UniProtKB/Swiss-Prot annotation:
<keyword id="KW-0272">Extracellular matrix</keyword>
<keyword id="KW-0879">Wnt signaling pathway</keyword>
<dbReference type="GO" id="GO:0005125">
    <property type="term" value="F:cytokine activity"/>
</dbReference>
<dbReference type="GO" id="GO:0050830">
    <property type="term" value="P:defense response to Gram-positive bacterium"/>
</dbReference>
<dbReference type="GO" id="GO:0005576">
    <property type="term" value="C:extracellular region"/>
</dbReference>
<feature type="disulfide bond">
    <location>
        <begin position="19"/>
        <end position="30"/>
    </location>
</feature>
<dbReference type="GO" id="GO:0005109">
    <property type="term" value="F:frizzled binding"/>
</dbReference>
<feature type="disulfide bond">
    <location>
        <begin position="70"/>
        <end position="78"/>
    </location>
</feature>
<keyword id="KW-1015">Disulfide bond</keyword>
<keyword id="KW-0217">Developmental protein</keyword>
<dbReference type="GO" id="GO:0060070">
    <property type="term" value="P:canonical Wnt signaling pathway"/>
</dbReference>
<dbReference type="GO" id="GO:0045165">
    <property type="term" value="P:cell fate commitment"/>
</dbReference>
<protein>
    <recommendedName>
        <fullName>Wnt inhibitor of Dorsal protein</fullName>
    </recommendedName>
</protein>
<keyword id="KW-0964">Secreted</keyword>
<feature type="disulfide bond">
    <location>
        <begin position="126"/>
        <end position="136"/>
    </location>
</feature>
<dbReference type="GO" id="GO:0031012">
    <property type="term" value="C:extracellular matrix"/>
</dbReference>
<keyword id="KW-0732">Signal</keyword>
Amino acid sequence: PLSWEDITGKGLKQALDSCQQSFQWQRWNCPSQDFVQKNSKPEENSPNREDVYVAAISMAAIVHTLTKDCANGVIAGCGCTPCAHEPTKALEQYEKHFGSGSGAIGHNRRVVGALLQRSLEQECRCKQPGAVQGECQEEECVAVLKPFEAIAQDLLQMYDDAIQLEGASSNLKIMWQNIPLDSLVFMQDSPNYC
Ligand code: NA
């Protein structure tokens, strides 16, 4: 049975580790205190570039966790009966629980959504019940999400290439097919983290 408390918990832990690893050298080195506070009370009116990353990496980690756990059959209501990952299904349960959003927030959730949809790889396992990879001559493959570290690198890149918006509203939907879906957006300048 789906528990959003456990999913979010595991997601945010994974998200924090990726955040602290990707920013360990930067001036804003993703301190745990600020990361958690950004998730407990996210800036939704005029987010800066770091607000955007934290929300993005957190959403991505939660969906990655939900997608993976569903395929592993640990969550009732989703999964199989080798089970292929279904990130789109997970993205829908995410948009149900958490809001759809608007302004920069809404657009960025779509950006993260599209990324996870194109973050599929495949994993193969031996047909034999107890065979290792160096043994079997026949394997069965299913679609699975990339390791989260790779998705995290993509988000870091999108964080680097983010577009700043001027005169944008947090209550208006950014026009569909106006801003590319592979670009994150932010509105506010970042403060001096030193
Ligand atoms: Na499941």
